[PDB]
Amino acid sequence: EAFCFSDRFCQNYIGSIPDCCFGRGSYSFELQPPPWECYQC
Ligand SMILES: *C(=O)[C@@H]1CCC(=O)N1
């Protein structure tokens, strides 16, 4: 599963959860990713 972040710019990682985006944050396939991997929710 992708790494999930609560904040838009993948600053706050909240673990990798099945729901992933509880809020409209971001997620990525790399914990603290490059700009292009910082996929917003
Ligand atoms: C998530 O994309 C992958 C698939 C299983 C796991 O633990 N990570």
Sheet holding 39-40, edge to edge: 3-5, 26-28, 39-40
Protein residue closest via CA to atom 4 of ligand 1: 1
- The DSSP bridge partners found for residue 14 are none
Please give the distance, rounded to the nearest whole angstrom, from the Cα atom of residue 1 to the centre of ligand 1: 4
All structural domains of the chain with their residue ranges: 1-41
* DSSP character string of 1-41: --EEESSTTS-SB----SS--SSS-EEESSSS--GGG-EE-
The answer for residues whose C-beta is within 8 angstroms of residue 34's C-beta and 6 or more apart is none
Protein residue closest via CA to atom 7 of ligand 1: 1
Beta strands at 3-5 and 26-28: parallel, antiparallel or unpaired: antiparallel
- The DSSP bridge partners found for residue 33 are none
**What residues does ligand 1 touch, defined as CB less than 6 Å away?**
1-2
Q: Which atom of ligand 1 is nearest to the CA of 1?
A: 1
Experimental method: NMR
